[PDB]
Design a protein. Structure first.
Lengths: 141, 119, 94
């Protein structure tokens, strides 16, 4: 078949990691407006019947621990998985409050052989974060 | 939007308009979407007395734009000694780095501001 | 026995192309998340997910431009970046 099976009892988890304030030591700025994103995402996804869990201001260790635990939950009754990351970034990197987390480390928990209740199911990572500091000047069209 | 007007009056060097907007409750830490603050603008454009009245009313001396540039970086780039002096007095971080890994000190070397390299 | 790749069935919906800053507004939030939620609200009952994300790309690319009091940061643009390792179409109404 051409389409993912979406008529499992539950649409799935929508995990939102909303990092707004960062340790002084890291020198990272307060992310004004991230709360507007977080609320907008919760409304949108709960309306799609996702089970929305919202997490605010996690350290790098807390993000990894969160993702490990979630990947070890029973997703057998869930059609999909959504994870939204709202933070500072660099290429390949999302920031916890105290420092950088490797995106590949986060997502590896949900690999087909490591999270077996999500094997064959769509795993959606939505990443609102910088991928560097390049600016696109655009072109007239 | 008092915040926007303030950023605008600051860029324009309008010390009186700056003062009136502040008396009216304008956020001295207003920001555009790139993290540019009134202090960044005043420091870059050489508006010494605006720099002083912003710092007096709680402008964040160490605010950085999306390229990690602080007011100290910008004052350093144009070589405004008095503004650099005032920022340092308000506890500007000489050891804060921008995107290119460059310090306010490092800029003083690049632009050859012999006189800037000590404070 | 049939296998699929362990890396299959992931989608990474980035707000921005590799290398690039991702723009946000203090009041309305990030350009990408605003556009993503608006496109999901309008189209989740009408379009396959990749087609939803393509409208998101068009919305971010055409409806937003940075405003800054510093010319270095002014009039900048953004395209999001859809990275799909999905093996099937995704419809929310199914």
């Amino acid at each position: 078949d051409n389409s993912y099976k979406m008529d499992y009892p539950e649409m799935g988890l929508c995990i939102i990691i909303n990092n707004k304030n960062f340790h002084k030591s890291t020198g990272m700025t307060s992310r004004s407006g991230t709360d507007v994103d977080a609320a907008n995402l919760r409304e949108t996804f709960r309306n799609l019947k996702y089970e929305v869990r919202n997490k605010n201001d996690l350290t790098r260790e807390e993000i990894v621990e969160l993702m490990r635990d979630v990947s070890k939950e029973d997703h057998s009754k869930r059609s999909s998985f959504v994870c939204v990351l709202l933070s500072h970034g660099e290429e390949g990197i999302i920031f916890g409050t105290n420092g950088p987390v490797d995106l590949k480390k986060i997502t590896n928990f949900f690999r087909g052989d490591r999270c077996r209740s999500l094997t064959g199911k769509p795993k959606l990572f939505i990443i609102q974060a910088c991928r560097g500091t390049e600016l696109d000047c655009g072109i007239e069209t | 939007d008092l915040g926007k007007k303030l950023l605008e009056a600051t860029r324009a060097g309008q010390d009186d308009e700056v003062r009136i907007l502040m008396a009216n409750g304008a956020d001295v830490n207003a920001m555009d979407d790139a993290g540019v603050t009134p202090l960044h603008l005043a420091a870059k454009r050489g508006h010494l007395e605006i720099v002083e009245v912003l710092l007096k009313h709680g402008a964040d001396v160490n605010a950085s734009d999306i390229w990690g540039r602080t007011p100290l970086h910008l004052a350093a780039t144009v070589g405004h000694l008095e503004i650099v002096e005032v920022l340092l007095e308000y506890g500007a971080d000489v050891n804060a780095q921008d995107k290119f890994g460059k310090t306010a000190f490092d800029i003083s070397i690049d632009n050859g501001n012999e006189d800037l390299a000590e404070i | 026995c049939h296998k699929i790749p362990v890396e299959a069935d992931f989608l990474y919906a980035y707000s921005t192309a590799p290398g690039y800053y991702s723009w946000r507004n203090s009041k309305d939030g990030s350009w990408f998340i605003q556009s993503l939620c608006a496109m999901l609200k309008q189209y989740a009952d009408k379009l396959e997910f990749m087609h939803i994300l393509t409208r998101v790309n068009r919305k971010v690319a055409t409806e937003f431009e940075s405003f800054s009091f510093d010319a270095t940061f002014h009039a900048k643009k953004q395209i999001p970046c859809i990275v799909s390792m999905l093996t099937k179409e995704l419809y929310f109404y199914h």
